[PDB]
């Protein structure tokens, strides 16, 4: 029911990816590590790096046992070189247990780490399916599980803080909770719905109807979910495939009207500032992602509004005004749930049921008028043609 | 071959540099200079040194003109402080004229001069931008042009001999040539390919495509120019940004495959030895580095051969083997095309039509299945932007 000892025990923003610590190794060596739900390698960096102010270091843990292979893991942000190995894990604001997981000791990399993110390594937790160098190489969440009593299942809260967080500041604020084997209540509002885990290998769902302010995209489903639709922690923006992407910006632009942006703002690149308190927010429409339910003929929606997928972002001039990039991409591998979207709501990646849980998390930033939600039940017909094949 | 005069006028090899004979002062104080198209000062040991069997003794020349003024300069190499001062220069195997020119006069150097390089000073040849103390002290070349009707331009065509040369034949080998004021045609084969100056202060060019074999690196074509991409004769490596090297080594391993070589030899620290005339040329990759066309939107590629990157060396204990050093090292000062390079090639630096031009060079080392080229034009894009800007 609660889970007091892990509560708030994330920090960072969705532009820079939300970080848990833990530690590696005999003595422990403590680090900073990115939760990716998007990927299912445990790496660490294993030598120094401009953006790094520390890093594993193998030679200095007792415990450390070297697999003797390299591996190559490139993904779309960047991509890094590593050493395989082995030693023993924990996690400071987690269960109270230690586990001998694979690491990959990072020795080169290409746009991977991010400069003034504070975290120094990336936890994959995805299935083995896609882990590198193949499925082989267990997962840290597998063995966890094998290893202990942990239920199996985590649930996330990411908390965005609705403004820019300075240096200083994303560095003291408590970005969220990963809560480990369980599910906390006092983390969200209303009921929680879920979606099944359509195969594990990222965590996919199946999304069956869009809509912008009520208005349905009107896309074959198939469309939302091609060539797959995953949550995924590791990414910022809602990403959409290509189709959809045109489709929701020509939506979103035809429903905020009364204000025209320019190009660079609906592509992701260039930032739109209000004077400071005046973002309309009420001129942005809301976006409704339905997703199959556990129950034959069954959905439930899921709305996001313009607080979630405008993210707010420090203006060049460090001026007063308040300023946002639009945090909707396009995609052409699929739609991608990311960070953006992950903090309106608390959820729950349930393992042990091949399901994931939403619910309207006690965090998100809403407006007086306005609030995220959860709800359904919707019928809902043919909903298996959505998936792609 | 329009300038007989000076064709052969250089000596030396990749490790060691390849140097000029210069008389300095009145009468003439003949010297052995190291042609260095990666700095702009022009200095001579003036006083005694371990490495040195002669030096220039101002004393002595009635034309000495003392500047009254020390300068330090350090290069990533070595260092050395000298006294600055002018004096009459000459190029015995160069254009016939006399010029009155800047000297820095090493009175003392560290990890400079070289142990039987025989050479005894340095011709920085790029512009006053980089000269030391500052841009006022005007290049030699500068001098050159300013004082005689030389056009304003050089040409070398730097010669490795594909094996190692003992000291006794390092001596008497011809190492190239540096035509002054001219380009002569009997020094390349094909055709010219030129590429724009980006600026004027070491000779800057923009890299937009690099191939490993044909195989595309792939990369933002700004990592190839960061902080930027010279021609250097002063260095004998191709020595590329961190991240270029990595993913280079790593293609260049890929595709040697078929043979196993220890970390030290992909460092350039260690050598590989086979026996005498085995060396397997065939499994190491060609590599072509794609350089900013005069034409927009139009490129060309200089392709050089393992027989280039793999530098000669004499095996540790002499025998009979052929041995190398891997020449392609990493820079954290931008892509360095370095002698090693040089060889495959004969370049042309235009400095009055802000251009360097690349044609395969009469001397470099090749096999019979595969030759260095200088091919284009490539239709490329936004090229510009593969320039890098602090
Ligand atoms: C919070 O976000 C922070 C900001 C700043 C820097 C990145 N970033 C983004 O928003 C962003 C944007 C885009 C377009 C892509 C990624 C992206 O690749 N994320 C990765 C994780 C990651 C995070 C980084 F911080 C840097 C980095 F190198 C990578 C995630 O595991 C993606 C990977 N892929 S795969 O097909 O490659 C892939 C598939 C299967 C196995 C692997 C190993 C990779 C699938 C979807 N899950 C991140
Ligand atoms: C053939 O090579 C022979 C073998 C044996 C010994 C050296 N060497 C190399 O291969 C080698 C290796 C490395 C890593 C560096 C150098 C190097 O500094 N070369 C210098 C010239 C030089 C040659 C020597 F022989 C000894 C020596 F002291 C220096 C060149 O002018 C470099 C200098 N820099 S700057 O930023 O410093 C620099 C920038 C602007 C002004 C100055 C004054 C220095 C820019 C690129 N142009 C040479």
């Known amino acids: ?20 610590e833990m530690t590696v190794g ?3 060596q403590t680090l900073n590590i990115l939760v990716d739900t998007g990927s299912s390698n445990f790496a660490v ?9 520390r890093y594993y270091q193998r030679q200095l843990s007792s415990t450390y046992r070297d697999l003797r292979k390299g591996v190559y893991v490139p993904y779309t942000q960047g991509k890094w070189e590593g050493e395989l190995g082995t030693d023993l894990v924990s996690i400071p604001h987690g269960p109270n247990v230690t586990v001998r997981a694979n ?48 239920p199996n299942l985590f649930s996330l809260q990411l908390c965005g803080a609705g403004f820019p967080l300075n240096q200083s ?12 084997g369980g599910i906390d209540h006092s983390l969200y509002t209303g009921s929680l719905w879920y979606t099944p885990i359509r195969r594990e290998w990222y965590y996919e769902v199946i999304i069956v109807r869009v809509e912008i302010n009520g208005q349905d995209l009107k896309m074959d489903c198939k469309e939302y979910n091609y060539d797959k639709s995953i949550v995924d922690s590791g990414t910022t923006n809602l990403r959409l495939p290509k189709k959809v992407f045109e489709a929701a910006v020509k939506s979103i632009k035809a429903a905020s009207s009364t204000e025209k942006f320019p190009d660079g703002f609906w592509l992701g690149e ?28 069954q959905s439930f929606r899921i709305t996001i509004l313009p607080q979630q997928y405008l993210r707010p972002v ?40 091949k399901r994931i849980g939403f619910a309207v998390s006690a965090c998100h930033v809403h407006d007086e008028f306005r609030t995220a939600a959860v709800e359904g039940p919707f019928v809902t017909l043919d909903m298996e043609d959505c998936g792609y094949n």
Request: contains cysteine; charged residues 15%.
């Open 1 to 20: 029911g609660s889970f007091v000892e892990m509560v708030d025990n994330l920090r960072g923003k969705s532009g820079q990816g939300y970080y848990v």
């Open 45 to 53: 960096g294993a030598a120094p790096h401009p953006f790094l102010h």
């Open 103 to 150: 690491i990959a000791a990072i020795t080169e990399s290409d746009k991977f780490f991010i400069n003034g993110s504070n975290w120094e390594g990336i936890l994959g937790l995805a299935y083995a399916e896609i882990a590198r160098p193949d499925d082989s190489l267990e997962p840290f969440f597998d063995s966890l599980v094998k290893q202990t009593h942990v």
């Open 270 to 297: 260039q930032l739109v500032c209000w004077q400071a308190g005046t973002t309309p927010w009420n001129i942005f429409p809301v976006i409704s992602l339905y997703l199959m339910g556990e129950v034959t003929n």
């Open 26 to 28: 005999s003595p422990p």
């Open 169 to 180: 500041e994303v560095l003291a604020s408590v970005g969220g909770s990963m809560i480990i």
């Open 314 to 353: 420090e203006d060049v001039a460090t001026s007063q005004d308040d300023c946002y990039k639009f945090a909707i991409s396009q995609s052409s591998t699929g739609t991608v749930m990311g960070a953006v979207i992950m903090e309106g709501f608390y959820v729950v990646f349930d393992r042990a049921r």
